Design an enzyme around this catalytic site. Structure first.
Site, mmCIF file in Angstrom:
data_model
loop_
_atom_site.group_PDB
_atom_site.id
_atom_site.type_symbol
_atom_site.label_atom_id
_atom_site.label_comp_id
_atom_site.label_asym_id
_atom_site.label_seq_id
_atom_site.Cartn_x
_atom_site.Cartn_y
_atom_site.Cartn_z
ATOM 1 N N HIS A 184 -12.801 6.223 -13.117
ATOM 2 C CA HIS A 184 -13.938 6.957 -13.692
ATOM 3 C C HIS A 184 -13.906 8.400 -13.209
ATOM 4 O O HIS A 184 -14.949 9.067 -13.074
ATOM 5 C CB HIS A 184 -15.309 6.296 -13.254
ATOM 6 N N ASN B 271 -21.378 -0.337 -16.867
ATOM 7 C CA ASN B 271 -20.433 0.130 -17.933
ATOM 8 C C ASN B 271 -21.114 -0.053 -19.303
ATOM 9 O O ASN B 271 -22.284 -0.540 -19.409
ATOM 10 C CB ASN B 271 -19.131 -0.707 -17.923
ATOM 11 N N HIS C 275 -22.992 3.880 -5.721
ATOM 12 C CA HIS C 275 -22.427 2.653 -5.160
ATOM 13 C C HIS C 275 -23.326 1.465 -5.411
ATOM 14 O O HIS C 275 -24.558 1.561 -5.075
ATOM 15 C CB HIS C 275 -22.200 2.895 -3.701
HETATM 16 C C1 HEM Z 1 -17.358 -4.864 -12.308
HETATM 17 C C2 HEM Z 1 -17.242 -4.014 -13.297
HETATM 18 C C3 HEM Z 1 -17.394 -2.658 -12.853
HETATM 19 C C4 HEM Z 1 -18.199 -1.659 -13.441
HETATM 20 C C5 HEM Z 1 -19.100 -1.756 -14.621
HETATM 21 C C6 HEM Z 1 -17.925 -0.537 -12.553
HETATM 22 C C7 HEM Z 1 -18.526 0.731 -12.856
HETATM 23 C C8 HEM Z 1 -18.079 1.901 -12.136
HETATM 24 C C9 HEM Z 1 -18.628 3.196 -12.516
HETATM 25 C C10 HEM Z 1 -19.617 3.407 -13.629
HETATM 26 C C11 HEM Z 1 -18.056 4.173 -11.596
HETATM 27 C C12 HEM Z 1 -18.325 5.650 -11.636
HETATM 28 C C13 HEM Z 1 -19.606 6.032 -10.895
HETATM 29 C C14 HEM Z 1 -19.722 7.513 -11.141
HETATM 30 O O1 HEM Z 1 -20.213 7.897 -12.251
HETATM 31 O O2 HEM Z 1 -19.301 8.288 -10.231
HETATM 32 C C15 HEM Z 1 -17.142 3.388 -10.717
HETATM 33 C C16 HEM Z 1 -16.425 4.004 -9.626
HETATM 34 C C17 HEM Z 1 -15.629 3.228 -8.672
HETATM 35 N N1 HEM Z 1 -15.498 1.875 -8.751
HETATM 36 FE FE1 HEM Z 1 -16.526 0.463 -9.965
HETATM 37 N N2 HEM Z 1 -17.021 -0.729 -11.590
HETATM 38 C C18 HEM Z 1 -16.739 -2.058 -11.718
HETATM 39 C C19 HEM Z 1 -15.783 -2.798 -10.923
HETATM 40 C C20 HEM Z 1 -15.159 -2.208 -9.748
HETATM 41 C C21 HEM Z 1 -14.469 -3.103 -8.789
HETATM 42 C C22 HEM Z 1 -14.282 -4.599 -8.835
HETATM 43 C C23 HEM Z 1 -14.055 -2.192 -7.743
HETATM 44 C C24 HEM Z 1 -13.325 -2.639 -6.545
HETATM 45 C C25 HEM Z 1 -13.208 -3.951 -6.332
HETATM 46 C C26 HEM Z 1 -14.481 -0.837 -8.108
HETATM 47 C C27 HEM Z 1 -14.198 0.303 -7.298
HETATM 48 C C28 HEM Z 1 -14.670 1.646 -7.684
HETATM 49 C C29 HEM Z 1 -14.217 2.820 -6.942
HETATM 50 C C30 HEM Z 1 -13.291 2.845 -5.734
HETATM 51 C C31 HEM Z 1 -14.857 3.907 -7.648
HETATM 52 C C32 HEM Z 1 -14.885 5.375 -7.367
HETATM 53 C C33 HEM Z 1 -16.255 5.707 -6.731
HETATM 54 C C34 HEM Z 1 -16.303 7.061 -5.990
HETATM 55 O O3 HEM Z 1 -15.269 7.655 -5.729
HETATM 56 O O4 HEM Z 1 -17.424 7.517 -5.613
HETATM 57 N N3 HEM Z 1 -15.096 -0.764 -9.432
HETATM 58 N N4 HEM Z 1 -17.043 1.974 -11.094
#
Ligand code: HEM
Ligand code: HDD
EC number: 1.11.1.6
Lengths: 726, 726
Positions: B101, B174, B365
């Site tokens: 993202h 999402n 988060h």
């Molecule tokens: C389950 C479905 C998931 C959805 C709907 C979801 C949604 C998101 C969204 C919307 C962001 C961006 C937030 C922003 O606008 O800055 C994001 C960032 C992130 N996600 Fe999740 N995610 C999901 C699953 C995961 C899973 C399973 C992991 C790890 C196991 C994960 C690890 C991360 C990481 C490392 C970032 C970057 C955040 C940052 O650097 O501040 N994502 N995800």
């Protein structure tokens, strides 16, 4: 075992044309292509086949599909060290992108000089025609991020790291012979003006916005490289078909200590060629990785990118013999005045294995010179020397970036520097200082000398007061933009006018448009009048009377500034789309394919679906891509063989394929009943230049098509394309 | 003074339609729009007007155009501290982009609930319909880098930070109601498979490559969110016109300690709307910033994005009553089984001031919850709780990322944590530990209770052994993809077929395409056959005999899964192109603009050059863009007024504008002699639904156009568009 039993998952380790096989890491695609840097990387190359999956601590993993939980529907436990190590490494994969030139594509190769240059420089890598120097080269755009598109309009970087026996030399150049600004103190101003605007972070990969043209309108020193960006130089067909330049005057120093001024050039042995704007802009959508893809695939096919290094050489006594200052990076040295002397050849012949480790972490810096070279007081170069070491401290995590494998020298390196984050080398020297007696003062300083000597700076005289002041010799802005304009062909001039018109159309404050048009009126009134008409602006009487800037040392043109005025076309490595039908005349296709193969031209067989079609004689034709999937943007020419033309003649995608190729000035060849497609593009019965047509693809049909391809595009079609709705 | 005397450099600080004024920082565009979090950032907002240019240490700069040198043509001196500070700060501007993202666009706003929810949750921000909570929202794509394009085919993120009186709550969702994978342990494998391949770092912003489909074919749990991605949900028209979902089951906990399972939803009040694929892919080249731009410009126009928060609630006793597991994030809960209860409204009403400071450095988060919420054992959510804190240590430079202004709570925060890089808060507490007597144990723990209490986890019963094992209840992969397929309209099903066909055509290894078509045959044989036909694959007899998966708890369809089955159109904030000529019939233009303004629909006036044209009554019309500069891709509908139509009748770009709009299913309206353009798009004299035509543009003509625009696209034209070459 999940691989297919026929082994079709693995690309052949032999040269293959674009599309024939999946692409792979260079050491698996071309394991026998070697050079001393590639061999030196063997200590860190990691395989995978036949090995167990482990943690980074070497513990074998049994189940890489599940977290450890209390019950199979229960909570995840903190004691799952295997999950946490894998997600921790993932969570910290990214490093900061480069401040500028974040978007780039790189490859390994080698350089050899044509003869010893010992009379003009003591640089070891130029001392002997049988001395081969490995190189790593990264090509780039300037403004956009690492995930921006390749075929934007922008200047391109052309950076070469030479792993010499007396040190790394980096020649960090661009594809135009001057830069936008004079003094490095303005570089963050200029880059902040071209980059996406700070409130909303728009636009990506485009200079067509108010702040760039505000700055240009206020800083007329920018106008010369603005001219080059607005020409078709700003939209190269490939990294293989653009020029390179070091921009600054540097020095060569020979063993007798004589200094010669030098500017560095790279000549592309594939010729110069650019896209047209509408095609470039559409291509950023249909394939934002087109230049990265094209470079990688050329290397896999054995169409190695080749460039000839050349030097413009000016004796120390001629420093002041031009109308412009040799130290001013907004000025070019016309080749009519100082010709480029051929020095040696660079061939890029192997792709990286891992893009992050080799391309993303590579560090190039123009302060990395070797004995036999030296700097000048060009005030843009002087500030660059500070910046490239400083920026690696954050980008690459600290002062040990020369230990990341791609950046390591191949020659010895030893000194008293210690520690820092990520320190790899374990020093055994009892001393970490000099002078020392406890290690008999080793490693020791080395006096300067003809070969294998210590670096010493050329003892140039400095005389002046400490000032923040631009040299009055730099205060001339319009004569080089005008020399550039007058050197272009009529179609290239049209394309410049359209580049400025398109860009200023996106500037929302109209006064900024007007101020830019006024600057154009100081360069050439035909240019300023044509751009003003497209903007609906009328020049004032005062603007119509601005006196033109002077000629540059007597020149009113120099053809070496044009991409096309002097023919240098090369068809090898280009690609043609062949539009199939469901019963292709097989004799046409035999003739087409073998003529293309004889000249090293690639083909892509296209249809309305994937799979196969069967020709008149039973030959089974494998399909590469659909019409919409591999659009005419991605090819150099289009050929339609005869057969059942009714299959495709009312297909909207097939017809539009030809309209798009026709608008973008590409050669088109129509055999047999494919000539029915002449009505789609409005071609007259007695035909027109740039359209090849015959009863069959035999006799001279393929020679005529290939002639057109060596001229790149059909510029005479430009007046015919404005009516066409495509 | 470099500003123009007329003040035309500065945008009015009032709501204006897109293109009327240059865009600006939020606090300058809308200084009277406030909320508690926007006010709280006043300590760090910095102005500029009337202030002197300084170093970061506050020293006034006299000459910011030059480096210090010894003589005006001499070398730069190391003592130039103003040059070095300026270039050091530039050198270190970039920070790592988000691992996923990375590409996203953000805005400030506010939320309030419709009624108190205290019977089901003690969360303070849901307790009072008149207590407003500020929010900051970031929308995003998933795969591409921060400089990739907006209108790719991908899932979109929808992250909301709620600055509550009892802590920050982040709802990190999402735009589809499930994810691709079941357990967080696999996230790095899935993300690596969809991201650019590691040897060459291609393709950006696209899942249409071998590794992604290799992983999908070998992991059938992915197929449900793959189906959403290949549908037009993958290509939304705007972040204002998509749904949001938290995906996981969470818990609500009320004051009596009762837990209710909940899934979170956002309903777009502007309605659901997506692009078509050819339009979306061409837009990534013509405007890679289209969604970021449209969101910023909707907020500047007063067309604030509004979403309704909604909850699906499931009592604890009903955990096991469905035929899928509530904790499996690849399963959705159909709204026909469990309705969405409306909970409150969110309005985004101000753009940030500085994109880097506020958007790039924002940290969301899903473990940032507050009392009255809790987690479940969903094995994907459980691993997410580790990741989002871990990743900010590198991205944002250390453990004080909550002190970066955008991330700061507006409620009190006090504890015993100290130090870390770039520590802002200066603690005065004599104690840095508890229990302490030296500060009478402050700050103190707080018992849980009905309001303002300490956080306590819900005391869920855990029973099981320590296993890495997937719950057998999660091992069903085809019934939800099927429910989704059957709930689409016929045109939506055709676009899903086209999305899988286009993608698998770009997979080089043919056996992977075959493997995916075999997975499709387990969901629906009509889908599998239609994809197979496009790929030239024929289903085997065994494949034709695969028994379809079971219905989901008796459902044959659920129309809430379609974008379009149930009309929910809203024209406010949409935009029409008006194609001018050099003598516009002013009566038509008056009528058009009056009807558009009444429904809040904007217009952009386009011509073949910039500047102005004069209508028949003398009215001077400024031109927003050329036909090529602002293509039909950027608008919702096209209107051509009468006048001197011969001016533009044979203009290639005007005729193509209509062909492209027609192909993309947009409403087109032709007044008077503009009806001559019916020939370009092959409309019979009798006319066709989706083309509005009359002698003049009047009340009836505009009502018909606006009715078409409320239904978004003209789906009934689909059989007619394959003919046209565009
Ligand atoms: C389950 C479905 C998931 C959805 C709907 C979801 C949604 C998101 C969204 C919307 C962001 C961006 C937030 C922003 O606008 O800055 C994001 C960032 C992130 N996600 Fe999740 N995610 C999901 C699953 C995961 C899973 C399973 C992991 C790890 C196991 C994960 C690890 C991360 C990481 C490392 C970032 C970057 C955040 C940052 O650097 O501040 N994502 N995800
Ligand atoms: C005073 C600052 C400064 C100025 C005046 C320039 N640069 Fe630069 N350049 C940078 C500061 C910088 C940088 C911040 O140091 C970069 C970005 C990341 C890196 O490692 O170096 C960089 C990167 C960079 C790269 C990409 C190297 C790579 O592939 O990694 C190229 C090709 C150039 N520059 C070329 C030029 C040329 C030909 C210039 C003028 C003749 C020029 N730069 C001026």
């Amino acid at each position: 075992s999940l691989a297919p039993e026929d082994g079709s998952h693995r690309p052949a380790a032999e040269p293959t044309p674009p599309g024939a096989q999946p692409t792979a890491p260079g050491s698996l695609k071309a394991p026998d292509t070697r050079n001393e840097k590639l061999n030196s990387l063997e200590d860190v190359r990691k395989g995978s086949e036949n090995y167990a999956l482990t943690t980074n601590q070497g513990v074998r993993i049994a189940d890489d599909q599940n977290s450890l939980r209390a019950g199979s529907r229960g909570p995840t436990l903190l004691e799952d060290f295997i999950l946490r190590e894998k997600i921790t490494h993932f969570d910290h994969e990214r490093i900061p992108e480069r401040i500028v030139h974040a978007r780039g594509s790189a490859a390994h190769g080698y350089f050899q000089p044509y003869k010893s240059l010992s009379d003009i420089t003591k640089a070891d890598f130029l001392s002997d025609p049988n001395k081969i120097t490995p190189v790593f080269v990264r090509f780039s755009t300037v403004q956009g991020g690492a995930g921006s598109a390749d075929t934007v309009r922008d200047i391109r970087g052309f950076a070469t790291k030479f792993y010499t026996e007396e040190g790394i030399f980096d020649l960090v150049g661009n594809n135009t012979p001057i830069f936008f600004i004079q003094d490095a103190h303005k570089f963050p101003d200029f880059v902040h003006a071209v980059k996406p605007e700070p409130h909303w972070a728009i636009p990506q990969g485009q200079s067509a916005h108010d702040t760039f043209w505000d700055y240009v309108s206020l800083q007329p020193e920018t106008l010369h490289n603005v001219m080059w960006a607005m020409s078709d130089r700003g939209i190269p067909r490939s990294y293989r078909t653009m020029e390179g330049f070091g921009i600054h005057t540097f020095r060569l120093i020979n063993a007798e200590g004589k200094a010669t001024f030098v500017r560095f050039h790279w000549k592309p042995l594939a010729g110069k060629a650019s896209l047209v704007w509408d095609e470039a802009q559409k291509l950023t959508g249909r394939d934002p990785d087109f230049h990265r893809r094209e470079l990688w695939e050329a290397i896999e096919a054995g169409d190695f990118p080749e460039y000839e290094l050349g030097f413009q050489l000016i004796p120390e006594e001629d420093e002041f013999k031009f109308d412009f200052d040799l130290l001013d990076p907004t000025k070019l040295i016309p080749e009519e005045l100082v010709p480029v002397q051929r020095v040696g050849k660079m061939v890029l012949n192997r792709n990286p294995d891992n893009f992050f480790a080799e391309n993303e972490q590579a560090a190039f810096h123009p302060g990395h010179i070797v004995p036999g070279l030296d700097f000048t007081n060009d005030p843009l170069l002087q500030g660059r020397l500070f910046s490239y070491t400083d920026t690696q401290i954050s980008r690459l995590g600290g002062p040990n970036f020369h230990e990341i494998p791609i950046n390591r020298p191949t020659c010895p390196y030893h000194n008293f520097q210690r520690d820092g984050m990520h320190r790899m080398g374990i020093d055994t020297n009892p001393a970490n200082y000099e002078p020392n007696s406890i290690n008999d003062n080793w490693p020791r300083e080395t006096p300067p000398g003809p070969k294998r000597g210590g670096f010493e700076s050329y003892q140039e005289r400095v005389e002046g007061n400490k000032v923040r002041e631009r040299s009055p010799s730099f205060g001339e802005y319009y004569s080089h933009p005008r020399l550039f304009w007058l050197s272009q062909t009529p179609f290239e001039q049209r394309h410049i006018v359209d580049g400025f018109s398109f860009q200023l159309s996106k500037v929302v404050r109209p006064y900024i448009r007007e101020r830019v048009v006024d600057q154009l009126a100081h360069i050439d009134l035909t240019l300023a009048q044509a751009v003003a008409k497209n903007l609906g602006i009328e020049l004032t009487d005062d603007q119509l009377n601005i006196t033109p800037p002077p000629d540059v040392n007597g020149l009113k043109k120099d053809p070496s500034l044009s991409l096309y005025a002097i023919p240098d076309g090369d068809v090898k490595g280009r690609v043609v789309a062949i539009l199939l039908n469901d019963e292709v005349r097989s004799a046409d296709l035999l003739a087409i394919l073998k003529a293309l193969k004889a000249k090293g031209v690639h083909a892509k067989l296209l249809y309305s679906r994937m799979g196969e079609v069967t020709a008149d004689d039973g030959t089974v034709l494998p399909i590469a891509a659909t019409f919409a999937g591999a659009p005419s943007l991605t090819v150099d020419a289009v050929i339609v063989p005869c057969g059942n033309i009714a299959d495709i003649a009312d297909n909207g995608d097939a017809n539009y394929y030809l309209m798009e190729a026709y608008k973008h000035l590409k050669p088109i060849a129509l055999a047999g009943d494919a000539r029915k497609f002449k009505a789609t593009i409005k071609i007259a019965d007695q035909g027109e230049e740039g359209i090849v047509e015959a009863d069959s693809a035999d006799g001279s049909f393929m020679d005529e098509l290939l002639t057109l391809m060596a001229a790149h595009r059909v510029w005479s079609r430009i007046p015919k394309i404005d009516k066409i709705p495509a």
